[PDB]
Structure formats: structure tokens, C-alpha cells
Design a protein around this nucleic acid. Structure first.
Lengths: 919, 397, 400
RNA sequence: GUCUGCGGCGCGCGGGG
DNA sequence: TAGATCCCGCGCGCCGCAGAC
């Protein structure tokens, strides 16, 4: 206990060799930077009898669990690896279901592939929904084909459960499935949408390729292009761009794969599929064969790159992610799209009214003095008697006979003649585009919506004369940035915004709607509201394609377990579905899960129509999401790695000291407590700090500061080197880079340039595209990022294997790890939810302890030994008490409030018998 | 801010010269001009189409202007100045209708009528719990001045829905009402809604309009869980229970009532626009689907004549085509066209058509639009078609 | 007799408990009308407004207050249900304890606020505004439709009837011509929406207020019932309304200012609707009412086909009908499916112009069954062409 | 023996994640 | 930082077509 605050354990021998010199060094280091003398608040001690460990250490314990979890899938992988494949059959079958091709291509119908291992590929017809159309599979024995039954002509009208394929036996051993982008095929494999778990796991050659000589995003562009800037190119021969054909070319030397030129699946109809069935089936089988080749060349190399069984077990577990939706995903889509349409129509009406009111300057020539529309041409091109109710039919038929020169004179732009040129361009024709009375067909995308609204700053034409919005837009030819405006345009000066296309830019205009010198102004009623509309609309405008058209498969009543049924919340004409995120387990140079929509940073935010995407991922009744976000995961990992490099004590480096002791309130915390005082503001100093532990420099920091607000380069990180001086004081010489400040980044630098596995915890090797030994290169920033982010991936892997071990050793009915930006959720039955919290806490205890066991730290601080809060909920939201903008509130839907536990969950054990509640 | 001048100049406001804003809001104003009556009729028709014609399972509801039921002393501060106002200390020379049960009462809202007709609507329907009753009419309310009976046009729609979805139905109705108020409004941002709670704890939404004086309530929605309905008919509940699903349950009634006169006043206020414009042009930019006069036929120089019968024929054809046209070619001696155009725009005249000496041969008549102060040339043929297309565009969107 | 029961069964009329007898329906004491009756009354009111307001050139809408307030009302002179206290309604106060006043000092001779039984007073009050609206046109007029309350006899109840009142101002020389033209127009209106125009009749009456007046009667099965009354009132009422007003009440006819002659024609909309319904009613109990005034025009039903497909077809048909302004009866969503004959009988009792049935054949080919109640003939019509056929039939009915 | 606008075919530039 | 370049819109010119005046 104590020694500046440490926890009491159950595992462990005596040990206790801190070292007097180490303690003296740590104390004299904590003397500077933070104050060595802080009484701090001793947290309550927790007595917890851990479950029986295996082996003699924690590393061996973790090595035994992962071997127990990866043994049969590795057996199946080796069964595939040591297999011989006969030639492809001459003629594929036409029968529905599965067809097996024995010797000499003898076609026999089979129920399912009764094989312990497979290489699987699926083709979908984009025109006819998202149901699969044909699949080809192989095993060590023979070939298999599947036809999807849509080749007949009947109506099905979507919303079915037998639409996808079938790959799992009735279980009346482990069923490995190999593929490229195997998540996409897993979305169609079926028996993966069941809430009850299944023992099939998936190996994605995309994931292995990212592990084995993957490519960065800045390197993918340079690889495609070559199909300060001086670089070595010896990594080109080991790295691909993640395509089946290219991966097969890279790992296997042979003829390039041919592609379908007509592309009858992406751009075609089902009739084209029926006509070209043999060719498309051949193409699918070719893809499967190349996949098998790649897998055979990958698996032994894979196990060489990541010798730890834990990495493989974690990849297997992370390949099965599961998002229940529960009947409100469609409702969320419908209300979101309706609100989108309403706001769009309102903004369009406001724009048309602004255009109409802009015509009054024509009545008095006053457009010339107007700073807004001065540059527009504004040229006025033309472009008693008895009622006599008779000859109506002749008059009606004269219009039909008026083809030729009679209708040539009016043509399209005849209505509202004499109006200025711009207004006539907005006005459509009378006949073809209906009339749409007014200047319809007007939107923000046009160059004319500016100067009809907005025009803040001083001069804001927004003309795409190789410069877009022109303007110095700051104090001090004539009338360039003057308030009256009406520039002579004697000579263009791209002042003020001198970055031009060099800066990466972003949607910084959306948060600049709030003040930021971006509002309409004189309009009063309809001007600013259009900008408000854009602010509320942009997110859904950009992302409705992805959020919509998500593959949702609605489980029938027979596909649900006895727990979802016989619950207080049931039926109500309810649809309980699921979305497999189609997430690649390793999708980056770091083996992070990558998913463009589900795995991004977003939360329910007011004044955003397309928000609360994470919500509506609602657990089935009788089940709940038990999950947690690790408290500054990457920050603590950098701190612990830096602390282990400096001495044996956790808080020695003064950056892990602040991470351990610093608090949000009444505490020196880097996020929202300090780094705003030296910096600008909270929630930007967080982004400022997270960019430094991932590797950055004065250029990126200066650009980030400029993006934060309108400040010159001197106030930016050009004259401001103080953030660089007081934090990340690396590359310091005359020291025979290491620390010299709060942050110890030299451990990551030494990790990157070592040629070893470089992972301090699980020993997962870096991609061969980034190894200095493979190629001397200066991609150091990506590697520094990789160390911390792949340590985070290893933390996730350790959490996954530990949670699986605890759920299988103790009968905890939970599964389906969903990982989102260092946060982990588990869909667990309600009756065991508290245990799932405790287990999760125990996991965070063991995982951190594992992170402690390596790098030479036999003890862990009490503060980080447990999660701050274990979020037990029926929904996926950042906090247990939050709201949304589009609905009235979460209680408009059936969303209660959860609980974050804390130390209450510690009043139990992990065995089934907790407090006598069971039985 | 002197918008009363336009209301007085055009036949859109009440006859009384002195019409205070408070009196108009309370419904004690002398009345409204023919343009105001037409605008109110158009708004009522649009609301009925949106709620009655458009919404399924909704049927019209008729409520008596006065309730002859004995009931009890109503929401009248003075009980006919009889029980509390006795001539002299006694002056017992005698209830004189002092008892409320003795005589009828002036209905103030359609809620009682909706409750009475709920049973009839349920019987008519096929036992379906979802039902609707709409009623638009004049309601009389007491206004005290430091008394009078003010009559205001109001539309009330009561939807009986299952209690489980009662909150959802109320929210949907509030959203529909807010959208309808936004539609046909130049600035939909002005009209908003606010959540409110009743004395007994009943929740609801109240619609408000941000008039230049301030925010004023123009509509109110209240949800009752079979409380008022049970009170009206408490003898039996089997006949008052609707079948929302496989079982019959007591329906929950969400009643939304909006003051039609208040809505018309708010729309008129919204039509008028307000600094830095540098272009002052008094115009009532009312929605075309609700404007009183859509087409205003006129006459040329008057030197050639032939315009009066042309306007009469255009009006007759529009009437045969469902378009209302004001025959403005009868009046003469104007001596100026700018004043006529300004008056028509202030009267919410969407388009003004003028026939000149070149109308007989090459009949390209002049067209002026309130929205854009620019002249156009249009052939005599298809003018009715153009007006119909503009009206359809306004109504649809 | 049976017509009232048929209307009540089909929701055409209100509850028969209070309006069992035809007297209640004839008078304003009836307990309202059913949804079909309400729709028919609305259609009739719209047609009357179009004929009186749309057809008229110099006629502009006129709004009159429901109740005429103030102590100005003469003492016990045309004071029926004059309370104005926000409570109570005493139609007759023949015998009261006259201690301080008839009922009370404050509530007698000061607070009348009695709802006018006719719009003639409102028209006289608003003539000043209407003259400015018509630019001092002597031939101008004002028409309005509203609820009028009348006293019906122990206690004297107040019966409310929806009546349309039109005050036409014409020169006194041409006042007789205007009255004759109004009588001819009334005859045309009666014969427009009556199956047998001979049933409608007119009678001439003379009175001190009006020398010549026309009264319209309908030959109901029970007997002749008055439905319209025309009074050619002189300028005396205008003089009484405006004491000492010179050149204000008088209208400019032929560039000469003279006291206008105002003729008031009041027609009972409810009475006319009841007469039309009785005329329509007559082995099969089907009311052959005019399509324009029919509460139900087109009814869509789903049967003998897929449930989802039938529901989708019915929803699409209803949406198309709504977009065209033609009301569509929501026949779908009913799972009773008692019988086709029962549905046809209900549609006939509901004044349904045509019955539309969609089945599996309609889903396969788009052709649905259309049946005409008047002709009792069933044919197959395209879904797209059904709307066009309905529009053509409506146009033919409007212009016959 | 013209020039008023409409149907496919090239170029440039940002913008989502 | 991970930070992106296939689809998706803003503009221009360019070449070919009816055809009265």
C-alpha cells in the first residue's frame, strides 16, 4: 500500500526491489514540474479474491488462456494450409442451395459444407437490394457453390431471414472461415445475426495484410501513384493497396487476376447475371482460389509476425461484432430524413425570398452601389370586347401545332422577361421543369447564394477564380477589406489567408456559425436562419448515404432465445434486428478496427439533425450493454511506457504522475483543467494533447492553433514554441531526446527504430512497409503513432481474451464485443450484468496488471486499477444521462436511465452465487 | 410599425376605426373586412383539408353554439348579476334565471361537443380506437375591461388514440400543427411551440406566434386520459372503450384548439416586414394559396375601351376554372397605375393583368407580380392555365 | 319515415332519440346532422356561395356579428333569448317577477346580446362598408351564410338553423326587376340540385315592409315546406339605421345618388339539404342525390387479394384522390368483410356516387371494379384512368 | 446567308472521411 | 493524430442542330 499510492493485490510473490537510486531520481524529478509534495486523497482499499490464475506468472496465465481459445481455429487453419486442391469443375451447377463438386467435377447437392475450414466469397447484386446472389467456397476436400435462389422469378420484397447464405452446422468443431474482406461476406453468411453466440470465427486476409506489410494512408497514395520528398522505395515490393488481385500478386508470383469488364453485379441487372452465370461463377471461384493462395502464403508468416497467441485470439474475438437495432433504426431514419427535407425546403424558401427581394435594386439602378451584387451582370435582356367563349378546341390544338419557330422564340427562359440575367438563370422553363414559380433551382452550392446572404468579414464574394472566397479579411487594391466594399479589382491579392491550398482546411465554417464573423446580418429574419439551417443540416446531408442503406436483418420469433421472449418488454409489433458493422478487425497500419460510420467519434448533439446515430443501438429486452471507456487509455499507455523507461515506479516521470493524480476539478489535469490556461480552451486542448502523444511538430501544432481561432503566425505555434518547450522536449542533444520535461517519448522512439517486434506487451511486429531494417526510411511519425495505438490494440486484445476467459469459466451469458475508439461494450444478459461489470473491472485490473507485468512493474496504482464508471445501459450513448435533438427526448423512445456503479459492484463475487440472489 | 393604416385602407380589418390590439386578440373587435373574411375562409379550408380530408379516420364534428343543458354556473365571473348583484339591500317586492340549471349556456369551446360525439364516432367506426373529430366555428368568451362577449373563430380537433401511444400521438399532432403553421408563412421561425403542464399534471404543447408586441399563444393542445370523457358518461365504460388492438381499453383524447382569428392576425403581421434594407415597399406578401384576391384584371389607357367586358369574361372563365378574379376594369378615373398596383399588392393581389391597345391583335398583355417589381408580357391564351399552375404550386408547396 | 332511419343508420343524420320526429329536423332544435349530412351541407353551402358570390360581379363578402349587443335594443322589442350575461337564454319573458325589472336591473333593457335570427340587420349595418367595397356601386350586394337562432315553444327553446342571407341593393325603379331576377335565379338553383324541379315552387306575398316578395317551398313527402323567403324591403329600414345621414346610405345609380332599395332573400340551408335528401330517397333504399352535393363521391375497398398489396393499393388510391381534391372513403382497414352486397348497400345509404373494389386482379393488371349506384352497373377500369373518369363524371354532373 | 438556345464531349477547382 | 482521394457538385470551352428573317 501507499508509496505515493498503490493498490493491494492477491497475485504475486515478494519481489519488492524498487532501488534507492531509482527512488531518489523519481523524487528529484517530481520536485520539478509538478509539486512532489501532494497529500492526495487515499482511495478506499478494495479486498478482492481474484479467480484462480494459471501458470506461474500473469504472462503465462494470459498465454494459456489465449492458447486454449486459439487451439482449434489454428488446427483448422493448418488443415487448410496442408491441403491440395483439385482443378475447378468444368461446369457449375444451376440448382439452388449448396452444391459439392467431387472428383471429375461431379455435382451433388449438399445441405451445407461439412468442413472444419473454408475459404469463402460472396457476390451481391446492387440493383436488386443487398441479398447475395452467388457464393463459392473451398475446403481441403472439394469445391462448393451456392446460388441464392433469386435466379427464379418471384417476389420476395425484402425483410427476410433466409436471404443470406448458410455456413454453420447444427452442432448436434470450431468452423474457421477465411476470406478477403471477410466481414462483408460474414454479413451474408447467416447464423451470425443470432443473438445467441456461435463458435465460428473469421480470418480476414485484409486484416493479416494490414498486419503483414500493411500500408499507411499517406503511403497508400504514394504506392498508387508509383504503381524533403526524397523517399526510399524498397517497401514497394512487400506492400500492396489491400485489393484481392493486388494482394494475390504481392504474396504470390503468378499471372494477374482478370476482372469482369461488364461488372454485372455493381452496375447491372439480375437478367445479366442469369445470362452470364458461368462467367460470373468462374470469376467468384477465381477469387476464392486467389484467397486460398494468399491464406496459404499468409498464415505461417502471420504467426511469425505475431507469435503471441493473445493477438490471434483477440483478432478472432473482434471479428464478431454485433449491433442490435430494435425497431427504431427505421424510425430514426424516417424522422431524420423528414426533418432533413423540411429544413431543406425551409432554407430553399428563404433563399428564393432573398432572391425576390434582391430584385428591388433593379427598380432604381441601385445595384451598382450595393456591395453584395455589384459584380453581377444585371442586364435587362427581354428574352366593348366580348368574352367570345368559342373555338376552345382550336386554341388548345394550336399549342400542339406550334412546334418549330412558334415555340423557338420563348424556349426555356421566356417567363418573367426583362429581368436581370442572374434571376433569369435561376428561373426554369414554363413547360419541361413544371413552372416552380419564382427563382427555383437555387441552393448553397451555387456561387450566387453568397451575396444573397452571409457576406460577413469585410468582402466575401465566394467566386471560384482559383481562390474561392477572396479577401484579406483583416484590418489594414483599395476597398479590398473595407466595410463599404465595392472593390475595383485592380489586382488580386491573396492576403490574410496565405495558406491557400497548402492548409488541409476542414468544415471549420460549421462551428464558425456561432459568432466567428459568419452571419447574414441585415436580413434579420430569413438571412441568419439559412445559416442556422446549414449548421443543423450538414451532418445528415453528408452521411445519410452511409447511415441509410445499412444491412439490417430482422430475426424472426423462432430465431430468438428464451430470454428475449417472456420479458416485460415484448411484441408491440416490434422488430428486433441486428447490424454486423462490416468492420475489418485490422484496418490500418495499426491493427485498429476500421468502420467509416460505426467506429467514428460522434454523439447526440443539439442543433444537428443526423446526430444520435450511436443511439437506437438498443439491446434486446432482457439483455443490456455493459461497457466502459478506459480513462485516458492512450494517455495512460504513453505514461506507463514512459514511466517504465525512466524507473520502476509508476509516477516517476511527472507525466504519469499527473495522469494518476491530476483530476478534472481541483486538479492539474491535461484535459479541460490545464493546457487550456497555457492554451486557449477546453475540448481543443484535448485535441491539442492527443496530437502530441501520436507524434506531431511545430507545423501541425501551429496549423491546429490557427484553425482554433483567427490568430496570426506569431500568436500561432511559430513564435509560440512554449508548448513544445514545456511538453515533448525531445531531440535534445549534449545528453550522454530522453524526457527533459514532463513527457518521455524516447521510449517510443527507441521502440520504432529497433527492428524487433517492437510491441512491449504482446510482441506484434510492425508492417514490413515501415521497418527500418526492411527499408531505411523517414516515416518516423507514423511509427511513433503506431507504438501507442497498437499498444491500445493489444490492450483491447487482452481485454477480449480476459473477458472471454471469465465468461467461459463462469457461466456469464454475454458475448459480442463491440469496440469503439478505446471503449468496449458487451451485450450481456441482465441477470448477470453486475458480474459483467465486475469481470470487466477485473479485466481492467488484469489487463493493466499485464501492462504492468511487462516493462518491469510488479505493482499497479489503486487509481487506475479499476474503471471510473461501468456504464450499464439499454443503449449506446457517451454518458448514461444524455439527450438528442430530433426527438423530443430519449423517453420518446423506450429508453430509461442506467447506472455507472463504481465500488458498489465490489460487494459481490464473480461466481454464480452472488449475495444469494441466484436460485 | 403603423400597420393599422394598411388594415384600414383595405377591406381586411374591422369596420370600427378604433380597434385596439388587445380587443382584436380577445375577439371583441367590431369584425373583419371582406378580405379578412376571405383569408379566414381560405385558412379554415386549408386546415380542414390537412386535418379532415388529408388525415384518415378523422370525421367532422358539429357542436351547438349554445348548450341548453342545465349544467351549473359556468366560467362567468358575474352570475348574471343576480346571485351576487341584488338590486338594493333586498328590494324583495325571484331567481330571474339565477339558477344555471333553469336556462341554457353560451358554449366557449368544442371540447364538450367532442366529448359528446366521441361515443357516436366510436359507434360509427368499426370499433377502432383511433378516431378523430374536427370542428371549426365561432366561440364566445367573456372579456373583462377595467364583461363583454367576444366571438372568435377557432378550429378544434380531438383525436382519440390508445393510451400507450397517447404521448406519441400528441407529439405527432403538435409536429403537424407546427409544420402547418410554418407552411404558408413567410417566416416559419416566428411560429413556435412550448411544453406546458396543467393544474392536475396533464402535459401538452401550446403554439405561439412572435408578434412585434411579443409572443402570443394562438393554439393549445391538451391530452386527457379518459377523464373528461368518463365524467361526461360515467354510467358505463364498456360502450366508451375503444379497441386499439386485440383488447378494448379506455381511449386517451388529445385535443388541439387554435384561434382562427388569432392565426389570421399573426399571418397578417408576418406578411409585413426591418432595418438597413434601404428599399421601403409596403406589400402584404401573403401565401398565394391563402391570398384573398389571386388575379386582378385591369384596363389600359381607357382611350380604346373594350377592357371592362374583357375583365368580366376573364372573371367568368376563372370562376368556371375555380380561380377568383377581382373585376377591376369597371372602376376608372384612377389617373395612375402605380397607385393601383400598390393597392392590389396591399390587398394581396398575386398578379395584375393589364390589356393595352395591342390586345386585340398580338394579344400580349402586361403582367405585374407583387413579389418582383418587374413587368412581363404574356399571351392572352393560357393566362387561366398560368394562374391555375401558380395556385397549384402555392397549395402543394 | 324510413328515410330518416336509413340516414341515421348510415351516419347521415344525428341521434334519432332527440330528433325522431321530422319537426325537429325541419326546425333548428334538431341535434345536428351526421358526417354524411355535414358533408352534404358543406357542399351545398359551397355551391350556394359560388352561385351568389362567385357568380356575382359587384358582390363582396360581408361579415356580421353573431349577436347584436348594447342597451340600444328596444324595450321588449324583437328581444328573444336576450341575456348577454354569458349565461342563461330566456326565449320568452312574458311573465316575470317585476321587482326591479323584467329579470334584473342590470340584465333587463341593457344586456340583450340576442343572436339575430336573420342576417338582414347585419347586412343593413355593413351596407356602409359594402358601398365603399363596391366603389359606391348602386347595384352591389352582400351575401353570407351563418347560424340563426329562433324561439320555438312550456319553456321556449332556441333552435339554430344554418341559413344563407343575401341583401341585394338595386335602384328602386329596377328593384322589381332585381326581385324577379332573384326569383328566377332561385328557381334555377332549385332545379339544379333537385331530381324533380317541379317539386320546387314559388309563391308571391305582400307586406308593409315589402310590397312584393317571393317565398320558396319544397314539396316534401309530408307536405309543402318553406325553404326560402324574399322580402323587398324599402329605404325605411336604411333611414332607421342611419338617422339624418345624407348621401351616405344612398347609392350612386346612373351617376345619380338616390336611396338604394335593398331586397333580402333568406334560404334555410338545412331545410334545402333535407328536401334534397328526401327527394333523392325513393325496392332498394338508395338516395339518388346529385354527385356535387353527395357527401361521398368515390369509395375504395380491398378484397379477394393479398393483404399488404390491397392495403398499399387502397393507400395509393386515397392519396391520389386527396391530391385531386376529391374525398375518398377509407373503405380499407376494415376486416369484417361481411359481404359485397352489404358493402354496396352501405355505400348506397352513404350517398356514395361510385364504389371501387381492388382485388388480386387489380394488383396483377391494375384494373379494379367500378360500380355505379345510380346505374347499378359494374365494369373494370384502370387505376390511372379511374381518376380521369371520376373527374369527367364530376364535370358532366356540374355542367348538365 | 446569318445568330438565338439545346444535346453529348473535353477541361479546371473543392468536398466527404 | 488516422487523414485520406472514388463519387459528387461547382464553373469554362468545343462541336453539331433547327430556321425564320
Amino acid at each position: 500500500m501507499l508509496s505515493r499510492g498503490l493498490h493491494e493485490q492477491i497475485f504475486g510473490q515478494g519481489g519488492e526491489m524498487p532501488g534507492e537510486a531509482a527512488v531518489r531520481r523519481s523524487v528529484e524529478h517530481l520536485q520539478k514540474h509538478g509539486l512532489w509534495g501532494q497529500p492526495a486523497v487515499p482511495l478506499p482499499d478494495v479486498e478482492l479474491r481474484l479467480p484462480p490464475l494459471y501458470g506461474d506468472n500473469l504472462d503465462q496465465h494470459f498465454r494459456l488462456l489465449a492458447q486454449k481459445q486459439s487451439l482449434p481455429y489454428l488446427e483448422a487453419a493448418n488443415l487448410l494450409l496442408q491441403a491440395q486442391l483439385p482443378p475447378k469443375p468444368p461446369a457449375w451447377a444451376w440448382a439452388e442451395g449448396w452444391t459439392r463438386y467431387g472428383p471429375e467435377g461431379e455435382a451433388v447437392p449438399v445441405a451445407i459444407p461439412e468442413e472444419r475450414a473454408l475459404v469463402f466469397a460472396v457476390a451481391v447484386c446492387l440493383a436488386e437490394g443487398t441479398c447475395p446472389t452467388l457464393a463459392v467456397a473451398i475446403s481441403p476436400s472439394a469445391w462448393y457453390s451456392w446460388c441464392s435462389q433469386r435466379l427464379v422469378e418471384e417476389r420476395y420484397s425484402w425483410t427476410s431471414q433466409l436471404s443470406p447464405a448458410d455456413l454453420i452446422p447444427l452442432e448436434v468443431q470450431e468452423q474457421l472461415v477465411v476470406g478477403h474482406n471477410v466481414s462483408f461476406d460474414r454479413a451474408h453468411i447467416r447464423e451470425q445475426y443470432l443473438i445467441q453466440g456461435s463458435r465460428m470465427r473469421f480470418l480476414d486476409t485484409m486484416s493479416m495484410h494490414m498486419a503483414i506489410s500493411g500500408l499507411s494512408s499517406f503511403q497508400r497514395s504514394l504506392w498508387i501513384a508509383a504503381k524533403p520528398a526524397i523517399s526510399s522505395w524498397d517497401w514497394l515490393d512487400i506492400s500492396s493497396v489491400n485489393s484481392l488481385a493486388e494482394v494475390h500478386r504481392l504474396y504470390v508470383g503468378g499471372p494477374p487476376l482478370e476482372k469482369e469488364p461488364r461488372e454485372l453485379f455493381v452496375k447491372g441487372t439480375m437478367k445479366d447475371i442469369r445470362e452470364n452465370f458461368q462467367d460470373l461463377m468462374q470469376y467468384c471461384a477465381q477469387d476464392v482460389w486467389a484467397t486460398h493462395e494468399v491464406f496459404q502464403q499468409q498464415l505461417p508468416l502471420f504467426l511469425e509476425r505475431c507469435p503471441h497467441p493473445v493477438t490471434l485470439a483477440g483478432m478472432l474475438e473482434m471479428g464478431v461484432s454485433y449491433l442490435p437495432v430494435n425497431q427504431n433504426w427505421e424510425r430514426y431514419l424516417a424522422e431524420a430524413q423528414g426533418t432533413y427535407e423540411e429544413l431543406q425546403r425551409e432554407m430553399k424558401k428563404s433563399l428564393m425570398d432573398l432572391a425576390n427581394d434582391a430584385c428591388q435594386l433593379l427598380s432604381g439602378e441601385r445595384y451598382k452601389e450595393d456591395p453584395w451584387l455589384w459584380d453581377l451582370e444585371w442586364d435587362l435582356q427581354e428574352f366593348s370586347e366580348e368574352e367570345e367563349f368559342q373555338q376552345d378546341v382550336m386554341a388548345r390544338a394550336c399549342l400542339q401545332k406550334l412546334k418549330g419557330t412558334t415555340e423557338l422564340l420563348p424556349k426555356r427562359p421566356q417567363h418573367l422577361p426583362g429581368h436581370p440575367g442572374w434571376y433569369r438563370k435561376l428561373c426554369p422553363r414554363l413547360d419541361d421543369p413544371a413552372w416552380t414559380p419564382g427563382p427555383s433551382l437555387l441552393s448553397l452550392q451555387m456561387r450566387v447564394t453568397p451575396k444573397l446572404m452571409a457576406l460577413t468579414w469585410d468582402g466575401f464574394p465566394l467566386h471560384y477564380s482559383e481562390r474561392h472566397g477572396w479577401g484579406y479579411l483583416v484590418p489594414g487594391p483599395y476597398n479590398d477589406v473595407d466595410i463599404p466594399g465595392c472593390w475595383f479589382f485592380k489586382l488580386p491579392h491573396k492576403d490574410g489567408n496565405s495558406c491557400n491550398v497548402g492548409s488541409p482546411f476542414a468544415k471549420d465554417f460549421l462551428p464558425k456559425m456561432e459568432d466567428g464573423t459568419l452571419q447574414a446580418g441585415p436580413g434579420g429574419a430569413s438571412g441568419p436562419r439559412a445559416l442556422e439551417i446549414n449548421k443543423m443540416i450538414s451532418f445528415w446531408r453528408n452521411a445519410h448515404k452511409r447511415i441509410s442503406s445499412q444491412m439490417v436483418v430482422w430475426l424472426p420469433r423462432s430465431a430468438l432465445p428464451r430470454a428475449v421472449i417472456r420479458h416485460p418488454d415484448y411484441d408491440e409489433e416490434g422488430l428486433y434486428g441486428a447490424i454486423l458493422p462490416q468492420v475489418v478487425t485490422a484496418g490500418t497500419i495499426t491493427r485498429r478496427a476500421v468502420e467509416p460510420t460505426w467506429l467514428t467519434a460522434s454523439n447526440a448533439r443539439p442543433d444537428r439533425v443526423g446526430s444520435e446515430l450511436k443511439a437506437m443501438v438498443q439491446a434486446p429486452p432482457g439483455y443490456t450493454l455493459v461497457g466502459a471507456d478506459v480513462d485516458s487509455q492512450e494517455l495512460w499507455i504513453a505514461a506507463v511506457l514512459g514511466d517504465a523507461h525512466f524507473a520502476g515506479m509508476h509516477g516517476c516521470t511527472a507525466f504519469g504522475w499527473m495522469t494518476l493524480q491530476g483530476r478534472k476539478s481541483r486538479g492539474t489535469d491535461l484535459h479541460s483543467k490545464t493546457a487550456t490556461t497555457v492554451g486557449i480552451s477546453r475540448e481543443h486542448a484535448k485535441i491539442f494533447n492527443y496530437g502530441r502523444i501520436y507524434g506531431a511538430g511545430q507545423p501541425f501544432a501551429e496549423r491546429l492553433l490557427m484553425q482554433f481561432n483567427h490568430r496570426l503566425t506569431q500568436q500561432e505555434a511559430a513564435e509560440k514554441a512554449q508548448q513544445m518547450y514545456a511538453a515533448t522536449k525531445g531531440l535534445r542533444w549534449y545528453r550522454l531526446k530522453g524526457g527533459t520535461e514532463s513527457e518521455m517519448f524516447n521510449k517510443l522512439e527507441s521502440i520504432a527504430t529497433s527492428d524487433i517486434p517492437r510491441t512491449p506487451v504482446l510482441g506484434c511486429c510492425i508492417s514490413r512497409a515501415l521497418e527500418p531494417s526492411a527499408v531505411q526510411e523517414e516515416f518516423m511519425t507514423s511509427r511513433v503513432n503506431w507504438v501507442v495505438q497498437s499498444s491500445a490494440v493489444d490492450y483491447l486484445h487482452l481485454m477480449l481474451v480476459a473477458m472471454k476467459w471469465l465468461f467461459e469459466e463462469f457461466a456469464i451469458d454475454g458475448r459480442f464485443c463491440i469496440s469503439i475508439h478505446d471503449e468496449v461494450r458487451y451485450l450481456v444478459r441482465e441477470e448477470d450484468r453486475y458480474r459483467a461489470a465486475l469481470a470487466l473491472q477485473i479485466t481492467n485490473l488484469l489487463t493493466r496488471c499485464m501492462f504492468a507485468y511487462k516493462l518491469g512493474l510488479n505493482d499497479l496504482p489503486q487509481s487506475v486499477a479499476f474503471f471510473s464508471a461501468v456504464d450499464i445501459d439499454r443503449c449506446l450513448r457517451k454518458e448514461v444521462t444524455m439527450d438528442c435533438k430530433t426527438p423530443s427526448n430519449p423517453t420518446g423512445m423506450e429508453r430509461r436511465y442506467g447506472i455507472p456503479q463504481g465500488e458498489a459492484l465490489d460487494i459481490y463475487q464473480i461466481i454464480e452465487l452472488t449475495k444469494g440472489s441466484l436460485e | 410599425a403603423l400597420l393599422e393604416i394598411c388594415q384600414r385602407r383595405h377591406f381586411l380589418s374591422g369596420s370600427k376605426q378604433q380597434l385596439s390590439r388587445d380587443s382584436l386578440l380577445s375577439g371583441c373587435h367590431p369584425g373583419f373586412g371582406p378580405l379578412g373574411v376571405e383569408l379566414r375562409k381560405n385558412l379554415a379550408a386549408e386546415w380542414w383539408t390537412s386535418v379532415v380530408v388529408f388525415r384518415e379516420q378523422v370525421f367532422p364534428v358539429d357542436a351547438l353554439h349554445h348548450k341548453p343543458g342545465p349544467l351549473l354556473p359556468g366560467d362567468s365571473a358575474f352570475r348574471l348579476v343576480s346571485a351576487e348583484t341584488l338590486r338594493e339591500i333586498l328590494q324583495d317586492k325571484a331567481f330571474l334565471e339565477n339558477v344555471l340549471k333553469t336556462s341554457g349556456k353560451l358554449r366557449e369551446n368544442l371540447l364538450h361537443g367532442a366529448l359528446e360525439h366521441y361515443v357516436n364516432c366510436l359507434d360509427l367506426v368499426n370499433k377502432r380506437l383511433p378516431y378523430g373529430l374536427a370542428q371549426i366555428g365561432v366561440c364566445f368568451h367573456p372579456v373583462f375591461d377595467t364583461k363583454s362577449i367576444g366571438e372568435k373563430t377557432e378550429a378544434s380537433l380531438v383525436w382519440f388514440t390508445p393510451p400507450r401511444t397517447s404521448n406519441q400521438w400528441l407529439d405527432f399532432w403538435l409536429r403537424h400543427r407546427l409544420q402547418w403553421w410554418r407552411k404558408f408563412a413567410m417566416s416559419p421561425s416566428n411560429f413556435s411551440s412550448s411544453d406546458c403542464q396543467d393544474e392536475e399534471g396533464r402535459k401538452g404543447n401550446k403554439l405561439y406566434y412572435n408578434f412585434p408586441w411579443g409572443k402570443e399563444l394562438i393554439e393549445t393542445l391538451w391530452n386527457l386520459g379518459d377523464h373528461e370523457l368518463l365524467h361526461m358518461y360515467p354510467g358505463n365504460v364498456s360502450k366508451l372503450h375503444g379497441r386499439d388492438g386485440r383488447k378494448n381499453v379506455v381511449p386517451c383524447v388529445l385535443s388541439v384548439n387554435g384561434d382562427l382569428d388569432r392565426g389570421m392576425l399573426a399571418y397578417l403581421y408576418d406578411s409585413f416586414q426591418t432595418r438597413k434594407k434601404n428599399l421601403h415597399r409596403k406589400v402584404l406578401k401573403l401565401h398565394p394559396c391563402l391570398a384573398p384576391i389571386k388575379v386582378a384584371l385591369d384596363v389600359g389607357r381607357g382611350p380604346t375601351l373594350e377592357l371592362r367586358q374583357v375583365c368580366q369574361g376573364l372573371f367568368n372563365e376563372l370562376l368556371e376554372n375555380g380561380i377568383s378574379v377581382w373585376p377591376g376594369y369597371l372602376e376608372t378615373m384612377q389617373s395612375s397605375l402605380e397607385q393601383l398596383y400598390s393597392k392590389y399588392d396591399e390587398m394581396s393581389i398575386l398578379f395584375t393583368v393589364l390589356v393595352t391597345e395591342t390586345t386585340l391583335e398580338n394579344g400580349l398583355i402586361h403582367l405585374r407580380s407583387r413579389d418582383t417589381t418587374m413587368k412581363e408580357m404574356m399571351h392572352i391564351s393560357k393566362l387561366k392555365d398560368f394562374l391555375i399552375k401558380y395556385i397549384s404550386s402555392a397549395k402543394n408547396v
